[PDB]
Ligand binder design. Structure first.
Ligand SMILES: O=P(O)(O)O[C@H]1[C@@H](OP(=O)(O)O)[C@@H](OP(=O)(O)O)[C@@H](OP(=O)(O)O)[C@@H](OP(=O)(O)O)[C@H]1OP(=O)(O)O
Ligand SMILES: O=P(O)(O)O[C@H]1[C@@H](OP(=O)(O)O)[C@@H](OP(=O)(O)O)[C@@H](OP(=O)(O)O)[C@@H](OP(=O)(O)O)[C@H]1OP(=O)(O)O
Ligand SMILES: [Zn+2]
Ligand SMILES: [Zn+2]
Lengths: 151, 383, 152, 383
């Protein structure tokens, strides 16, 4: 037991002496073991940047700072229409779809129910599989009824 | 007051300890916020072996139905983990300003098409308890029916003056929200913090407006004190949208999930200490605390010994837009005029496409309908 | 305060209960008329021989029960007017170019409403024998291409 | 009790008091309508200082999209004001018949080319709450910016689920609603009560079919049980078309609004009783109450075996058309035998021209797009 408690006391001091700032004793395996960080978060980069300049209230100072020394960023903002994506369909459950996709008296409903079931099956499908279902349905329609669909 | 059991996984323990220490340090300047720490969240900036808290917030309630506004002066959601994100947004705005003048001092650097975070700099989120929604189960969410396994991933949302979190699309929730509907007493639905953290992990934390300047920024880790909730927390915020593939600038961040060995969750401030109605938040960019009433999302103050004053919060949509336009004017990046808050957010092409794709993918995967707010919440102009 | 004002107020409060929905504003005394101040634009007092009490509940039923001879004419006649939209009454006959287009087209940002409408329209026109071959075919395509969505 | 200080407001309270007084009298016959007082509207007839309630109705919901029919047997809109207007139409048919049998007994007298109301007759509408749409989306004293005011005056529409309305922005929803599309899942757009009252004061309340016989009839006053209610309701109801110049005989009615200055109905209208799904309507013409299930827009009853059955409402399109055909056959008015509902409505050149001009003027002055129902709603033949 050497240097372990001497490393730990620094972390114990930070939580009481410097609230909000944490410094981890690295480059020393004995001192590094007191508070091991996850390997996914171990992004050690030799940057010239340091955290010491994060002054509290920096936004207040920068706003009152003179506008002359605020050089441009280059970017430029343009509006775009807020797409009125009103949620178009009245959703129905999967257990609901199976029955109405199975009924045989569809003509009495003028095939409204079966087509609605097909639509909501298509709506919940991903773009690739929905498109492939679309081509498949068009193909079987063109195959079975060339008389009605003149192609 | 005292941490325990070093040499274990304790980086999240240090985050918890320093969040509480910073909250208690802010107590001395404003004695009003004593006892708020029941539900506290914070965001830390990490660089190599140096940690710095940049956002701290408190609160576990949201905007009331009859107190909604159309000018964007009210805080719609005042939960601890959301106001922390808003404080982080303000800090990022301050950092953009610092880049405008002092490139070597700021965390940002000039990238290919937008500002890119400096190498080695990362943001970490800490929450006192489990995020509301999927991440926590106490009552009625128990086995007995196999169909409830679907509810372990389905979206959930909050309700004004309601408690807990309720599932979507039962009988009423499969319909758009309307300003004049929430007025006269339709229940306003706000997505749970678990789902909002999922959105943060998918589309980034910077939001739509700040996406104009900077590339997406993601939490490197999310820490929750509550024990043994790590598996469920990971499912709520990352796993259930892992298969999603957003557009090129975005990606689903594999957030590290950590927990603190010493923890407590009995503190829930719901008849636990005094049933606090107001909430507090602190940003490193501003350097001072702020207290808002979650019932109306406004800062309430007194003057000349006789008045009650309603004041918009610094985290409100109007203040964020005003800060945005101030940044643009200061940096001479021309903006269209007139422009509404909705138009400005929709102006970010990449972020809007990613958000639409994410919501559509959530709907398709039978996770739930993302309950958008009425357009009247964001139709106000900015000038 | 004033006894006349109190009397008029009691009159109106009692009239609220004695016959709900029927009101008789005070006009027998100019001072008593102040209990119910009519708006300036609504105070168009005019002399007329007709009165409220001549309205009876269920008068429509009473008038229908009367004989057809009692009823006089008004010297008018009703003429049909073809709507500006000349499309036929049942939209089962979707325009052929249209229905082929929404089937061949790819951009389904209408969220499959158009494709479903085209499918319903082609189903309706087909013979009953052709219709059933089509709909088991669509069922099989759905169960084969996207089984995670249908078989719950 | 009917608590009101009888000073400076009494007439509109007398409108409010007698509306509820009549309602509870109706409950004495059919107690089933208990709890429907949430959103109630009524129409009064005024002669020389005498009042008589003509129509009374309640409701805050509409027809669901999947329950639409092409035979006109379903009530598309079941809001309180809309059904009050429909009951007023039925009373107007009864009064036209009364003129046809005894001209002295009726409210109508023969004008230049149509039946005209006798001098002194006035119709007044009372609503216990602000009509949905523009009249409700604002309650603040001032908006500050004139732009946020003008987008607050844009036309709004309801949807088949929910008690609010959605802003129908210009150049949006220009695609006509289709019968197949709504049945496929698309939500049926119906115009808000504020815009419907605007149409009522522009084109008259009598509608297209009654315009064959009578001159346009306008509400002399519109009363709401909300305290301030002054400028917003004017803007929503008259002022938006105050510059419009409809063709003769139609004109924009400078309707008067008077406020129920005490006992304003908000708590009884904005909570609790929203669970109901059934609306009811009463009129002087029939003298009895009818309860209509709003979800499918039809009145249901128990059969002789005690099982549920359905039947069209007396206020539906089909019933109104049958009533008007009976009017013609009793009055000896010649009509074409094969006609549809819209063909009969289109048979009024003046009313149709005025309606088209009003819609086109709303188009040009970018108030929004009027959400016409699919034509198949009105293609059914009656005789
Ligand atoms: O910070 P939050 O409380 O989570 O607010 C967000 C935020 O809106 P603000 O910028 O107003 O804070 C989102 O915006 P972005 O992430 O896109 O920047 C988004 O708004 P949009 O989806 O409309 O862009 C969303 O709103 P919604 O709930 O409607 O999805 C939500 O706001 P809420 O607080 O209302 O949940
Ligand atoms: O229901 P009401 O408000 O009483 O008015 C309805 C109807 O409106 P809804 O569809 O909301 O029921 C139609 O209005 P649209 O929505 O189709 O525009 C229609 O108007 P058109 O005939 O021009 O289509 C017509 O109003 P009008 O009497 O002016 O003809 C109609 O009344 P009916 O229900 O008696 O046809
Ligand atoms: Zn929460
Ligand atoms: Zn309404």
């Amino acid at each position: 037991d050497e240097t372990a408690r001497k490393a730990a006391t620094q972390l114990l001091d930070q939580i009481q002496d410097t609230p909000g700032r944490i410094s981890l004793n690295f480059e020393t395996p004995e001192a590094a073991s007191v508070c091991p960080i996850p390997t996914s978060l171990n992004q050690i980069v030799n940057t010239k940047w340091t955290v010491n300049q994060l002054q509290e209230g920096q936004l207040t100072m920068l706003l009152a700072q003179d506008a002359n020394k605020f050089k441009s960023l280059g970017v430029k903002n343009i509006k775009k229409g807020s797409v009125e994506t009103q949620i178009l369909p009245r959703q129905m459950d999967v257990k609901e779809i199976v029955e109405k996709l199975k009924k045989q008296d569809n003509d009495s409903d003028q095939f409204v129910g079966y087509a609605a079931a097909v639509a909501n099956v298509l709506r919940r499908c991903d773009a690739e599989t929905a498109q492939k279902i679309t081509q498949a349905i068009t193909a079987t329609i063109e195959k079975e009824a060339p008389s009605i669909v003149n192609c | 007051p005292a941490v325990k059991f070093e040499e274990k996984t304790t980086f999240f323990e240090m985050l918890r300890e320093h969040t509480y220490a910073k909250f208690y340090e802010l107590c001395k300047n404003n004695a009003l916020i004593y006892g708020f720490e029941k539900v506290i969240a914070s965001v830390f900036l990490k660089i190599n072996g140096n940690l710095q808290i940049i956002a701290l917030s408190t609160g576990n309630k949201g905007l009331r139905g009859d107190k909604i506004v159309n000018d964007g002066t009210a805080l719609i959601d005042c939960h601890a983990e959301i106001l922390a994100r808003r404080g982080l947004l303000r800090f990022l705005y301050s950092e953009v300003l610092k880049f405008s003048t002092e490139p070597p001092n700021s965390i940002f650097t000039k990238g290919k098409n937008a500002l890119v975070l400096k190498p080695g700099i990362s943001f970490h989120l800490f929450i006192n308890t489990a995020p509301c929604g999927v991440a926590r189960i106490d009552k009625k969410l128990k086995p007995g029916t196999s169909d409830d396994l679907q509810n372990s991933s389905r979206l959930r949302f909050k309700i004004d003056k309601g408690m807990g979190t309720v599932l979507g699309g039962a009988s009423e929730f499969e319909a758009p929200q309307t300003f004049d509907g929430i007025m006269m007493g339709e229940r306003m639905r706000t997505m749970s913090c678990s789902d909002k953290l999922l959105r943060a992990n998918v589309l980034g934390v910077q939001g739509a407006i700040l996406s104009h300047f900077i590339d997406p920024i993601y939490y490197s880790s999310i820490a929750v004190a509550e024990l043994n909730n790590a598996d469920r927390l990971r499912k709520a915020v990352y796993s259930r949208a892992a298969t999603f593939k957003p557009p090129a600038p975005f990606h689903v961040q594999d957030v590290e999930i950590g927990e603190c060995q010493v923890e407590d969750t009995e503190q829930s401030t719901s008849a636990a200490a005094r049933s606090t109605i107001s909430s507090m938040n602190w940003n490193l960019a501003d350097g001072n605390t702020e207290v808002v009433r979650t019932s109306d999302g406004m800062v309430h103050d007194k003057d000349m010994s006789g008045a009650d004053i309603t004041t918009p919060s610094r985290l409100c949509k109007k203040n964020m837009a005003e800060l945005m336009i101030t940044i643009c004017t200061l940096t001479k990046t021309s903006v269209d005029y007139p422009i509404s808050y909705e138009e400005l957010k929709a102006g970010s092409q990449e972020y809007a496409a990613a958000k639409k794709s994410f919501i559509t993918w959530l709907r398709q995967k039978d996770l739930g309908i993302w309950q958008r707010k009425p357009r009247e919440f964001q139709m106000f102009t900015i000038n």
